[PDB]
Design a protein around this ligand. Sequence first.
Ligand code: HEM
Ligand code: HEM
Ligand code: HNI
Ligand code: HNI
Lengths: 141, 141, 146, 146
Amino acid sequence: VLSPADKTNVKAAWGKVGAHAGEYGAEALERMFLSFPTTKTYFPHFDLSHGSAQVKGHGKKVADALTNAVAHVDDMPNALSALSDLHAHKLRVDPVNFKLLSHCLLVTLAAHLPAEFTPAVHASLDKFLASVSTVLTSKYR
Amino acid sequence: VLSPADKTNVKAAWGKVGAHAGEYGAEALERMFLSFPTTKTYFPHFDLSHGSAQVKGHGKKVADALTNAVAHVDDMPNALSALSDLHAHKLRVDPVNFKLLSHCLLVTLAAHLPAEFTPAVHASLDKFLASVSTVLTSKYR
Amino acid sequence: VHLTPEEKSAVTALWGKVNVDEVGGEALGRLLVVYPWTQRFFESFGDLSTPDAVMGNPKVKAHGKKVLGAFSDGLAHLDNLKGTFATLSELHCDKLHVDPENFRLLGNVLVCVLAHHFGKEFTPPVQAAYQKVVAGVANALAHKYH
Amino acid sequence: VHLTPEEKSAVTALWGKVNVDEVGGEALGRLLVVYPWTQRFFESFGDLSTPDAVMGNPKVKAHGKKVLGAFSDGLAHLDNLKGTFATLSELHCDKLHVDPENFRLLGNVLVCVLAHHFGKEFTPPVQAAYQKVVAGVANALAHKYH
Ligand code: HEM
Ligand code: HEM
Ligand code: HNI
Ligand code: HNI
């Protein structure tokens, strides 16, 4: 469960990210494709070339979804309901990959939040991304 | 989430297990220790060889916990609350190991339920053991 | 990854009793029933809407024969699983775009199918040997991904 | 795993700039904070009640340095990680009873610590090379478990 302290840490950290969220979403995807190449099996229809506009566009969508989840951190199952439906029934991405994207999002945040990425905030962000992943895989079977 | 059919299937299968629950719990533990040696790191104080009295006794405890979970299948977070606290705070078993015991429980059931272990029942039991595992790892941080 | 001589003999002995075509269809079918997101690769196989629709699907059965046939052939090469499955690894990555986690799931389902079929004969030591095998095969199939 | 000449070069180049004392203390400390069940091996280390207590703990910092020092030594054996970590693998299994999942968790925390320290210099390709390394080291330390 996300504690009130977790929620405070997540909101403050994502607040600092601000309008950079879309960029960081794309960076996290790029980091994931490079570091965990098996995740590319879900994007064979994508242009994965360097600076890919398609990947950048998708990073923005991922970021916006996270921004919405932060804004509705008290009620994420409802906020992420349609997105959960999409991954469970249409995309059918194996649940193990959510930890890979989560790690890459965490690494991206660490690389862009020198002051803010304290051990406590690190912990809260990890819990938050796992909670998002839990909601997004809740309807798979 | 467990569907109405899942719960029917789990109750029927565990019902057929009947008085053998403790035996199967011990067998599942033995299968786990042999197939996944890393799990032995949590039991250095145990005799873990075949025919172990400690493993037989512990299998009964695991089985009893599962029986209680089946009895309270719509309220497992609360029915298993103390056991969740125990694994999270006293034992501190890494969450990755729950899938290993769950698999060995499944295999044990498959080996003992020729008629009952249909593909649908297999699916329901896997979901059930995953749900028990989720509850038992819900308080780790 | 490797097995003792006792484990190799146990694997071979049990496998001698396996109907590979049948166990293959059963394992692939159960994969698609128990982990239904794995159906994503098989839209062309038709009706996968219910457990019976999946298990009795002729195309699921035919593909199961093919998959476990390759698995079976690989049991003759337990010392070189990565080499054995290199071209299938490349194919599943480059052409089929199959997440290797699927190989791990299939391995686990196969172990359940063997347990279901053989009952008490699928002893804990026999399972341990087969766990080494399916992990080795899944790792081999994952090895050429890039 | 198996690093390319280009990846090997990237790893060594970054590591030459690493303060192993700081990064080791940070990595082990954050392991214990972020995944607090990992504290189970360190009751003898004293006060681990708060994040500040963990991070500032002299024994946590000393052990973090020792662990990352052995990690550092391993970087001179990138084509034989299993060989060089064989002794420590057996030690962690039989004497310390450490679940190898801990090695994987530490590896990912290390990657986070490196990103936190180096910022934009920890590029996606540099991360990818370090992911290969930490997976390789974790697998090497897990290899002799029984
Ligand atoms: C924190 C976890 C995740 C978030 C927040 C997220 C978010 C999103 C969003 C917002 C979309 C677009 C929704 C729409 O167009 O209606 C999407 C689509 C998609 N996601 Fe995710 N996702 C996550 C995890 C994953 C993972 C782990 C994978 C695979 C490795 C994945 C693969 C895909 C794919 C293949 C699409 C469709 C792309 C397309 O063809 O347009 N997602 N995701
Ligand atoms: C379905 C999952 C599980 C169930 C239902 C379960 C159940 C139990 C129960 C009922 C107890 C005894 C509680 C007591 O003494 O008050 C126990 C203890 C314990 N469990 Fe589990 N457990 C599960 C998963 C695991 C896993 C995966 C591990 C490690 C691989 C583990 C390691 C332990 C240990 C070390 C003890 C203490 C044994 C002792 O020293 O007496 N458990 N568990
Ligand atoms: C859930 C997905 C999935 C899994 C777990 C899986 C697991 C395995 C395993 C594991 C032991 C083996 C040995 C194996 C072997 C094979 N697979 Ni896999 N495959 C999978 C998805 C496929 C798909 C998809 C194809 C192409 C099917 C088609 O439509 O022709 C395929 C095709 C094959 C072929 C035929 C190759 C060709 O067409 O040239 C072989 C052989 N395989 N598959
Ligand atoms: C979370 C637990 C944990 C992790 C992730 C971990 C990860 C690692 C990694 C990963 C890169 C390496 C290279 C490594 C190396 C070492 N460990 Ni680990 N160790 C861990 C728990 C221990 C414990 C416990 C000891 C004994 C500590 C003490 O001081 O007694 C230990 C002791 C050591 C020693 C000292 C051995 C000796 O006495 O000769 C080395 C070297 N290690 N450890």
